[PDB]
Amino acid sequence: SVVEEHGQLSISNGELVNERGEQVQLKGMSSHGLQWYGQFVNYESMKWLRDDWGINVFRAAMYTSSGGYIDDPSVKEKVKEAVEAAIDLDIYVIIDWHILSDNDPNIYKEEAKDFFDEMSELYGDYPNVIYEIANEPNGSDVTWGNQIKPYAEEVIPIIRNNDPNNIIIVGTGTWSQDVHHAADNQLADPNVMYAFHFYAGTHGQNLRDQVDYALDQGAAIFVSEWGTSAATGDGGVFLDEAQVWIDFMDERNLSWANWSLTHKDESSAALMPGANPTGGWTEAELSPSGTFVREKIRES
Ligand SMILES: O=[N+]([O-])c1ccc(O[C@@H]2O[C@H](CO)[C@@H](O[C@@H]3O[C@H](CO)[C@@H](O)[C@H](O)[C@H]3O)[C@H](O)[C@H]2F)c([N+](=O)[O-])c1
Numbered sequence: 001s002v003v004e005e006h007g008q009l010s011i012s013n014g015e016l017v018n019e020r021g022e023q024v025q026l027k028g029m030s031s032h033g034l035q036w037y038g039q040f041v042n043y044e045s046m047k048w049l050r051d052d053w054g055i056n057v058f059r060a061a062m063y064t065s066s067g068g069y070i071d072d073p074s075v076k077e078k079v080k081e082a083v084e085a086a087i088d089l090d091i092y093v094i095i096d097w098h099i100l101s102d103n104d105p106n107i108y109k110e111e112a113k114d115f116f117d118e119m120s121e122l123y124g125d126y127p128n129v130i131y132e133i134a135n136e137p138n139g140s141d142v143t144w145g146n147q148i149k150p151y152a153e154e155v156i157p158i159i160r161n162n163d164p165n166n167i168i169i170v171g172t173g174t175w176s177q178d179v180h181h182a183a184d185n186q187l188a189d190p191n192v193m194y195a196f197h198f199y200a201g202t203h204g205q206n207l208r209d210q211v212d213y214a215l216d217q218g219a220a221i222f223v224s225e226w227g228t229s230a231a232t233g234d235g236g237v238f239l240d241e242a243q244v245w246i247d248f249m250d251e252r253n254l255s256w257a258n259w260s261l262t263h264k265d266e267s268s269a270a271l272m273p274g275a276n277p278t279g280g281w282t283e284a285e286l287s288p289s290g291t292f293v294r295e296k297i298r299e300s
Pocket residue numbers: 066100135136174175197225231232233234259264266268
């Protein structure tokens with residue numbers, strides 16, 4: 001009864017709060033690309049995550065390029081499937097317009113406006129939905145002030161015409177690490193959060209201090225993607241540094257989604273090769289990363 005209990009989420013003094021104004025922290029999993037590992041996104045696997053891991057949020061990672069939505073728009077129906085399951089399971093859900101190689105969110109802004117118009121029209125009267133309008137803006141030529149903020153200022157109005165106050169997570173520069181620039185030039189909408197993403201393979205002490213700087217400007221931060229691996233999503237599992245970030249996020253009441261729910265042979269993948277796509281995973285079907293993430297959510 002997560003959604004029944006906390007209901008409408010909003011931002012108050014830079015903090016995510018429930019409909020009674022109490023601080024709330026969401027912890028869950030992100031899918032991998034829906035064009036590749038969509039079979040792991042379904043009511044049964046999400047229910048298993050809710051019941052056995054304790055998740056209270058699920059992130060649907062709809063890549064735009066890399067064979068995603070722009071090339072084959074059918075993947076938007078898998079996002080709808082995930083939203084409907086979240087509604088049925090009474091958990092929160094993030095709709096992620098998962099830009100990456102298409103590094104400037106303006107490249108597909110017309111399609112983004114059409115997609116968010118459709119999703120907000122369909123689901124704008126449910127409290128479960130969180131819109132993430134540009135996963136990871138990246139590149140030296142893509143800045144908050146010149147590219148990202150103006151993009152958000154075109155897409156947010158589209159959403160707001162159908163859904164006036166569900167949370168919107170807006171990506172930041174340098175693969176959603178540059179929360180410092182965003183916090184110094186914040187968007188006007190009162191229910192916006194800025195995305196901050198990390199990988200435990202990178203020594204993170206300055207990045208933690210940067211998140212703190214942003215929080216100190218009154219900006220709300222959602223860690224909508226993080227991994228136990230290196231920044232490529234592979235290269236080793238770094239559980240000591242991941243624990244430091246877990247403790248940091250708890251102290252700052254930061255919500256998060258781990259990357260990712262797939263059996264792909266890479267360190268950040270939570271599942272091993274024989275894991276059933278509909279859940280019920282034994283200890284051996286979880287990777288070293290999945291075992292750790294499951295423990296962190298169960299402990300919460
Ligand atoms: O340098 N960084 O800080 C940084 C941070 C984040 C990041 O990218 C992000 O974080 C992971 C790990 O890099 C990416 O997932 C990886 O996407 C690859 C390309 O689709 C897949 O082949 C790989 O299986 C998958 O795990 C997510 O799409 C992307 F949001 C990347 N990146 O993709 O290069 C770089």
